[PDB]
Each structure stands twice: as structure tokens, then as C-alpha cells.
Write a protein that binds this DNA or RNA. Structure first.
Ligand SMILES: [Mg+2]
Ligand SMILES: [Zn+2]
Lengths: 162, 726
DNA sequence: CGAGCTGTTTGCTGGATGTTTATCCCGGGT
DNA sequence: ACCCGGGATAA
RNA sequence: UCCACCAAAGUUAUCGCUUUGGUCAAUUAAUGCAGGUAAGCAACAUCCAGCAAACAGA
């Protein structure tokens, strides 16, 4: 299971790092796409992508590296790919899953859950967990607003694989 | 070698340099205005003279030279060398100035200062002359025949004779024979008499009709004789001597309350139309140059405005012999580039041969052209299980047209619709002086607002077309963001959301700021907003961030953005052509995929005349496009092809009753007989279970194509049409 | 082929003809 | 004297 | 005043029929096809006669 890390900077000041554990064996294609975006193998990735939608106590979202507002993003396999599987569910906080605009509309955007989301089971593919830096995740969440607007410019300054 | 010309379409924004965009726009508008007046004023002159005196020499004034003077009279410029004018030019200018002041007063028009208007006037006046000649040559004979029928009182005589004979209990066949003997034959005699300029024999027409005929013939010269003894042939041979007569014909048509027809071509579209641009026009109007541009510097001048190295402007055609010659046509949004090879310096399947018919074995595609189903296509090898059937419907082609029509209907301002309704109270095709003057005044009273609305793409917009209107964003099921009806972008991360109905109400309005920020970053939205408006919108967005719950900021933003609700009519018109081309190519690709690349097409002989309660059809354009793509196309008669059951050659009937297909007519006419489903009269027609008969049911198009296949097989076997379908 | 009487704007379909470039010189200014 | 428009004509 | 395409069934080569599965560039964006990066192809303005939508009047 590949592990990846993001460096989060608010208003140009680093605030911490978050370490993720990927379900490579359970969800191969989605995990591979996420790893490629993290490492920027294909010339594009989450590097510099902003967290355009953070809802406190509910979720953080990001991964839009072409528009920074949720209307962009693309996968290595193309614009979008079909849902792979739902062998994992939003059962515990800290789960990393793919954001989509409906069935078979997965792209590059991802979201991290801060509370259980049983109602989202079967709708969004869950493909990772947060193993370290969850305090940094809470710190980022504290900068969010109920409407999703961020109190400060939060971006993934750097990304990589451990 | 012969001369051929090709046109390449494109958009101004894609090839036109930004710094020179504004000079072009105004020019277009100016030209359009002049052209519009160049029509109306011209008519305003003729109707003025013809009503003033019947001896007026109207025929000689239908020329490009007179139209050029008419066009120039609407443009104010410094006086030239008057003594160098020709006698014809002097007479034309005097005639124009006779009514110049009256026309300006009636139309509330002022001359537009436009230097170097010679070339534009020449081109537009050549177009006007061509339009006049084409209209007359096309419709003079038909309108003359209609007038002759009206003069003979054919309808009244036929009705009276039919009623009289029915009162006497005459058989319908005898009634028709008597009508032919007593009505149609004298009418043909009158037609023959009029065609040769000779008055009809006494008793065929009453005194009033004879007087009207004499008045009509007084238009022509007394000694003038129609070429080859036929007026209809002389009109084509020597059109210039009939124009005045045509006008009189129109009046006679209006004498008997016949539906008015446009005798004088006019430009009435408020949307700016295409105008021709050449090297001189570009040099003197767009580039604002002040010196003569020679042919050697021809392409250099264009290079300063457009990139001649693009795909559109490069060589094209066989051996790349079709080169661009510095001539374009543009209407402010779209552009057409003309290429030419020379310098500017001045069948039925039943009648096919044996080999031709037998070479199509296993490749013919039988098509049934319908109204709603444009093409129902079936291949020879089609069977009950191997259903090699294709359907190209009217909906597929009309998607974009219906979408644009609905959008225009929904986005039409109240002022625009009211102005159109008011302007519709005055007829335009009528040749009456008073009616035309009233129409001119009515158009002048509403021309400004209509031009502003339809010219919103490049013209100044001031009027508030949507007062007291608040616009709120919405998201559809497909996560597409629309302001009210304007597409913004697809939100790919919209579905992830928490439990609905949060505690704080103001978040719903706060999402408005996020939607506005997403919208304002779009190119097609940012380009439509000027710097000052964008600054004000950003300030209002900041204020909304300060006080999201306040609706005043939202109302102000809606008022500012009301410009975005104006439709780009010219852009939609341009996109319609692309949509039509894409539909044609998609149909060709589908035909080749389903029926193979070397498929042979057999189309029905139905002509599809334009009928009331029915939308137009591409019957002729469809065949032309199919032939242009290389498909071998042949025509097969549809006589009794859709009336007999293929399984047993028995007649079919319309049995099922269904609610009205059109929902709006259900309340008035709820239920009607079905049209696409039929049942056979054999009453077994199948291995029926005998429970309720269960007659074999056939789709009308499927039965028609099966009968076409039967006819084709019979032709192949015996080279003769089937006796049943003969 | 298939569905139930007038005017404008739009558009969709159909029919007809074209798709510029030198040269002169008078008004006006310096 | 010498030049800068800009209308008007014509193939 | 409404209807984008491809398939299964009621069903029998069954409708502007109904019930299901699959597809989506949504568009008030842009010269359109394809080739994968080269290299080829594609008639347009005006006017007029009809027909459809909105409105208003017979
Ligand atoms: Mg037919
Ligand atoms: Zn039968």
C-alpha cells in the first residue's frame, strides 16, 4: 500500500503535513491515478491545487489543478473514468475518497472526511485513509466555513510519495 | 478554364486583430443602415413618382447607377467636381433630391458622415439590382396568371355553375365537363389573348375588366411587341421593359383584395447583415489609411489585420489553385472568405439499364421519406430477426433550431415584443403610397430600440430590458451551473454535500458569492463585461461577503449583469450552419456504418411540397447532400407502396385511436386515428392464437420499405414494375 | 404526406445572379 | 510652385 | 407550443405507445470532418415565394 504526503501552506506559510495510506490492492486504478497526480508523473498534479471547499466538521475537498474552483481537473486515463468498486465505505473519519458529479464521473478531485458518512456509501469511491498529520487536517478544517469558503488561501504546495 | 469560387466560414474573434475590431463593427452597422434606407428610400421614390404621374419613365431607373446615387444621397461628404458629372448622374441626383427632404422628414433620418463610400455603394447597389431582376423574372408570370384568373372571375363562375347544375341534379362528371366547356376553355382563350397583347373577344370579360386590361397594357409602349409572341418569354428575354408593368400588376392584385406580395425588394431585418469588404474598403475604413493602396500592397494591408498564414486563408482546392483574392463578407460576428482561381482584374430506378440495375445487387438501401421521420432506411438483407433498420428523425436535425427558438421566446423583453406587435400593424409588401409611408413612420418610431436590442453584440446598450428583475444561480441534475438560463460551467465536485437543511439560513445566500466567483472567471462571461462593470461587480461581491443576507447587493448585481441576458443572435445564426453541417456528416457516417461504405441508396419519389401545419423539409437538399457525398441515389415511385400488406398484398387500414400527438391540441381535439400503425384486412395474416383475431400489425414505413424491396426484386427479375404497384 | 384568415421579428427550405481595381483633377494649404 | 485629400468615372 | 442517440420486452418487422438498460460538450463556447503531433477535404451574401413559434387583430 503506497503512502503519499502533501505539504499545506496557508497564505504562503506552511502549516503542516498530511500522510495518506492508499488502498492499492483493493482499488488499483483509483489509487494509481491518485499517486500519479501526487507525484506529477504526467506533467500535472495536485502541486499548487487549492482546497476550494472545506466544510467544518464535515469534509475537506481539493485536487482541482486546472481551475481551483471545482469546475476543473482531469484523470490520467482521460477526462473521467467509471466507478471502480465500493469495497470500502465511509465508516470512520479521516477517509480519503474521490469526488464526482454522479455515477461514473470520477476525476482528479478528492475529499477527506472528518465524520462518518454512511449516506455517501455506494456513491463515492473510498480509496484511502489518513495515517499521520490528522492534526494538520483539523487545523485546515478550522479555516473552513459552513458554505465551503476558506478563511485563507490553502494550497498543496508540494506532494510526493513516501 | 471556367471560373469557380469557394467560401470558407469563420468568426471575427478567431482571426481579426483586437485593435481593429471596433472600426469594423461600426462600419458594418453604418453600412446596414444605409442599405436599409437604400431600399426604402428607393421605393419611396418610385411610389412617389408613379402615383404623381402615370407617364413617369420608371423602367429606365432600374439600374445599378441610379441605386448608387440613391445610396450616396444618404451619406454626407464634401462636394466634388460637379462639372465632371454625367447627364445621367445629374438626372438621377435631381430626382433623388426632389424627395430627399420628404423622405428624411418621414423617416426621421439624418445623413451619416462616411467618407470613401463609393465601393460599398457599388457592391450594395449591384446586389439590389440583382435582387430586383431575380424577383421580377421569377414572379412576374405567376402574378400575371393569378391576376388573369381573378379578372375572369373564375372562382365565382365555377361556384355559380356548380350550384346551378347541382340544383338541377346533374351528375358530378357532367358538372365537371360542363364547367370545363363553359369556364376553363374561355379562361384559356382569355389567357391566350392576353399572352399575345391582344384584347380578348367581346363577351369574355366585362367593361371594368377590359378597362383594367387597357390600363395595364398602357404601361408598355404602343408599338412594342413581345419577343416570340409570348409575354412570359419576353419577360425573361427583355425584363427591363416590364418593371413598370409589374408595379401596375401589383396594384391590380390589390384591387381585388388579393394577398399583397413584395413587388419591390426591401431589407427589413434589424440584425445587421453581411457586407462585402475588399482591399480599398479595408484600407480606407478599417485601417483608416489616407493613401491609395495598389495591387502589389494588396496582401500587406490584410496582413496587418488578419493572419493570412492560418488554415482559412491558405491555398485550397485541386492542385491548390484556388487562392485568396482579398475579398471577405462579414456581418460583425461571422466572416466568409472567398477563394477563386482567376484574378479580379476586369434517375429513376425503374428506367435504369440492365447492367446498372444488376450492379446494385445486395447494396440497395430503401428509404421512406416522412414528415416526422425524415429517413426510414432498410437494407435488402433485413429480416424479422436481422433488423437492419435506421431512423433519422426530424428531432435530431431540429434539436438546435428548437433550442434557439425556445431561448429567444423566453428571453424576449417586453419592450421588444410590444414594439414588434405595434410595428406589425402596418403592411410592408403593399405598394400603396400611404401604407408604405405609414410603415416608414412606424419603423422610424421604434427602429432605435430594436436596433439596440438586436445589435447588442457590438452596439451600445443603455435601455433596461429587464427592470426589477433578480437573477439567482441554480444547478441542474447534471451539475451544470446556470445563472437563470445562461450556461456557466460543469461543477464536477458538486454532489459531495453534508446533511441538508443546515441551521444557518444565510449560507444559502452565501453560496451566491461562490457561484458568482465561479461565473466571473469564464472567458465568455468576462469578455462581455467591461472594466468598470467588472470592478463594480467585484465590489458588490465584497459587500455581499460583508452582508450576505442583504438583497440590495444581489439586485444591483442583477441590474449590472442584465447585459449578459441579451442573446448573440448573429452567433446563434452562425452556429446553426455548423450544427447543420455536423448533422449532415453524422447522417452520412451513420449510413456508411450501418449499411456499409459502398451502400446504394434508393429514395422515395415523394416531393414533399410545403404544406400548412407542417414544418419544412430537406427533400431536395437531402438528395443534393447525399449525392455530394458520393452515395449512388435513385428514385422509386411510391404508388400504392404504403397501402398493401407485404405479407399477403392485402390492403391496410388505420385502426388504432390515440390521443392527439401534439399536446397543445389535446384539449381541443383529444383523440385521433393513428397514422404509423396499420392492420391487415386478410384477418388471419399470421399464426394467430384465435383469442381476439390478432391481425398482423405493420409499421407504415416498414411496410413501405418492404414494398420498395418487392418492386426492386420484380424489376431485377423481369425489368418491369409489379402489376399490383403499377 | 398527414393534419386542422390578415400584419412584424425570427428561422428553415427553395430559386436566381455575383464574389475590384486604375485614373483624373479640383478644393485647399504652405 | 508643390503637395494632401476625396469625389467621380470607367473596364 | 413539448420530443438527443443505441438496445430489450408488452409484440406479431407494433405506433410522436408504454416499461426498462446504456451513452452526453452541458453550452448565449468555436470556421466543421478525420490524422493523432505534420500532410487533405468543405460555397457564401443578398433578395424573393412558401411553411413553424411568439404577439395582435378578423
Ligand atoms: Mg413513402
Ligand atoms: Zn396481411
Amino acid at each position: 500500500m503506497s503512502q503519499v504526503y502533501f505539504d499545506v501552506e496557508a497564505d504562503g506559510q506552511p502549516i503542516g503535513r498530511v500522510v495518506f495510506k492508499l488502498y492499492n490492492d483493493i482499488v488499483p486504478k483509483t489509487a494509481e491515478n491518485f499517486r500519479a497526480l501526487c507525484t506529477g508523473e504526467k506533467g500535472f498534479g495536485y502541486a499548487g491545487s487549492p482546497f476550494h471547499r472545506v466544510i467544518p466538521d464535515f469534509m475537506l475537498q481539493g485536487g482541482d489543478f486546472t481551475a481551483g474552483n471545482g469546475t476543473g481537473g482531469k484523470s490520467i486515463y482521460g477526462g473521467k473514468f467509471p466507478d471502480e468498486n465500493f469495497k470500502k465505505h465511509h465508516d470512520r473519519p479521516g477517509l480519503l475518497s474521490m469526488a464526482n458529479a454522479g455515477p461514473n464521473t470520477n476525476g482528479s478531485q478528492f475529499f477527506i472526511t472528518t465524520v462518518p458518512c454512511p449516506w455517501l456509501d455506494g456513491k463515492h469511491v473510498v480509496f484511502g485513509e489518513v495515517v499521520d498529520g490528522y492534526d494538520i487536517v483539523k487545523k485546515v478544517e478550522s479555516l473552513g466555513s459552513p458554505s465551503g469558503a476558506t478563511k485563507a488561501r490553502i494550497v498543496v504546495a508540494k506532494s510526493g510519495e513516501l | 478554364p471556367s471560373k469557380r469560387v469557394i467560401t470558407i466560414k469563420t468568426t471575427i474573434k478567431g482571426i481579426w486583430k483586437y485593435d481593429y475590431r471596433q472600426p469594423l463593427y461600426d462600419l458594418v452597422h453604418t453600412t446596414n443602415l444605409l442599405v436599409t434606407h437604400t431600399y426604402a428610400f428607393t421605393k419611396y421614390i418610385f411610389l412617389k413618382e408613379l402615383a404623381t404621374d402615370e407617364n413617369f419613365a420608371f423602367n429606365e431607373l432600374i439600374t445599378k447607377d441610379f441605386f448608387v446615387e440613391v445610396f450616396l444621397s444618404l451619406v454626407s461628404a464634401k462636394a466634388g467636381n460637379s462639372e465632371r458629372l454625367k447627364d445621367t448622374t445629374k438626372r438621377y441626383r435631381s430626382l433623388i433630391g426632389k424627395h430627399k427632404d420628404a423622405y428624411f422628414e418621414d423617416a426621421k433620418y439624418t445623413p451619416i458622415s462616411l467618407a470613401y463610400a463609393q465601393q460599398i455603394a457599388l457592391y450594395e447597389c449591384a446586389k439590389v439590382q440583382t435582387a430586383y431582376f431575380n424577383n421580377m423574372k421569377a414572379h412576374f408570370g405567376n402574378r400575371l396568371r393569378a391576376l388573369i384568373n381573378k379578372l375572369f372571375k373564375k372562382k365565382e363562375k365555377v361556384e355559380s355553375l356548380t350550384k346551378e347544375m347541382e340544383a338541377n341534379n346533374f351528375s358530378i362528371k357532367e358538372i365537371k365537363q360542363a364547367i370545363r366547356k363553359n369556364v376553363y376553355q374561355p379562361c384559356n382563350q382569355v389567357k391566350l389573348a392576353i399572352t399575345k397583347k391582344n384584347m380578348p373577344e367581346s363577351g369574355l370579360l366585362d367593361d371594368k375588366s377590359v378597362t383594367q386590361l387597357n390600363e395595364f397594357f398602357s404601361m408598355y409602349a404602343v408599338d412594342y411587341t413581345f419577343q416570340k409572341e409570348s409575354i412570359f418569354y419576353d419577360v425573361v428575354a427583355n425584363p427591363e421593359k416590364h418593371f413598370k408593368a409589374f408595379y401596375k400588376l401589383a396594384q391590380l392584385s390589390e384591387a381585388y383584395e388579393v394577398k399583397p406580395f413584395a413587388c419591390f425588394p426591401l431589407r427589413r431585418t434589424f440584425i445587421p447583415c453581411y457586407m462585402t469588404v475588399d482591399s480599398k474598403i479595408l484600407n480606407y475604413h478599417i485601417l483608416k489609411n489616407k493613401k491609395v493602396l495598389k495591387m502589389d500592397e494588396k496582401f500587406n494591408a490584410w496582413g496587418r489585420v488578419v493572419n493570412l498564414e492560418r488554415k482559412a486563408f491558405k491555398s485550397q482546392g485541386c492542385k491548390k489553385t484556388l487562392h485568396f483574392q482579398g475579398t471577405l463578407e462579414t456581418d460583425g460576428v461571422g466572416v466568409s472568405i472567398l477563394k477563386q482561381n482567376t484574378d479580379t482584374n476586369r434517375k429513376y430506378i425503374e428506367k435504369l439499364e440492365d447492367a446498372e440495375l444488376k450492379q446494385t445487387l445486395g447494396k440497395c438501401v430503401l428509404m421512406d421519406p416522412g414528415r416526422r421521420d425524415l429517413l426510414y432506411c432498410m437494407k435488402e438483407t433485413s429480416r424479422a430477426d436481422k433488423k437492419e433498420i435506421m431512423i433519422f428523425t426530424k428531432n435530431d436535425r431540429s434539436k438546435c433550431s428548437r433550442h434557439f427558438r425556445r431561448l429567444r421566446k423566453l428571453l424576449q423583453p417586453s419592450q421588444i415584443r410590444e414594439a414588434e406587435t405595434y410595428l406589425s400593424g402596418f403592411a410592408t409588401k403593399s405598394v400603396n403610397m400611404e401604407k408604405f409611408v405609414e410603415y416608414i413612420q412606424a419603423r422610424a418610431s421604434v427602429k432605435d430600440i430594436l436596433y439596440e436590442y438586436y445589435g447588442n453584440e457590438t452596439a451600445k446598450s443603455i435601455t433596461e430590458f429587464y427592470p426589477e428583475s433578480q437573477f439567482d444561480f441554480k444547478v441542474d441534475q447534471k451539475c451544470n451551473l446556470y445563472y437563470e438560463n445562461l450556461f456557466v460551467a460543469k461543477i464536477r465536485g458538486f454532489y459531495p454535500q453534508p446533511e441538508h437543511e443546515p441551521n444557518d439560513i444565510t449560507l444559502k445566500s452565501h453560496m451566491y458569492h461562490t457561484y458568482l466567483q465561479i461565473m466571473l472567471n469564464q472567458k465568455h462571461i468576462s469578455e462581455r463585461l467591461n472594466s468598470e462593470k467588472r470592478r463594480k461587480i467585484e465590489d458588490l461581491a465584497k459587500a455581499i461577503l460583508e452582508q450576505p443576507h442583504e438583497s440590495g447587493h444581489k439586485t444591483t448585481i442583477s441590474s449590472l449583469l442584465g447585459k449578459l441576458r441579451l442573446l448573440p443572435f448573429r452567433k446563434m445564426k452562425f452556429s446553426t450552419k455548423l450544427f447543420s453541417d455536423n448533422n449532415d456528416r453524422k447522417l452520412v457516417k451513420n449510413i456508411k456504418k450501418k449499411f456499409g461504405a459502398d451502400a446504394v441508396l434508393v429514395l422515395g419519389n415523394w416531393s414533399a411540397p410545403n404544406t400548412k401545419y407542417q414544418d419544412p423539409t430537406r427533400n431536395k437538399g437531402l438528395r443534393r447532400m447525399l449525392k455530394k457525398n458520393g452515395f449512388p441515389l435513385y428514385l422509386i415511385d411510391e404508388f400504392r407502396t404504403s397501402s398493401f400488406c407485404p405479407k399477403c398484398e392485402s390492403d391496410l387500414e388505420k385502426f388504432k385511436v390515440i390521443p392527439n400527438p401534439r399536446p397543445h391540441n389535446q384539449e381541443k381535439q383529444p383523440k385521433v386515428l393513428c397514422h404509423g400503425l396499420l392492420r391487415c384486412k386478410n384477418m388471419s395474416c399470421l399464426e394467430q392464437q384465435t383469442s381476439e383475431g390478432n391481425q398482423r400489425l405493420w409499421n407504415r414505413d416498414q411496410a413501405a420499405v418492404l414494398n420498395f424491396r418487392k418492386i426492386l426484386n420484380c424489376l431485377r427479375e423481369t425489368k418491369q414494375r409489379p402489376p399490383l404497384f403499377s
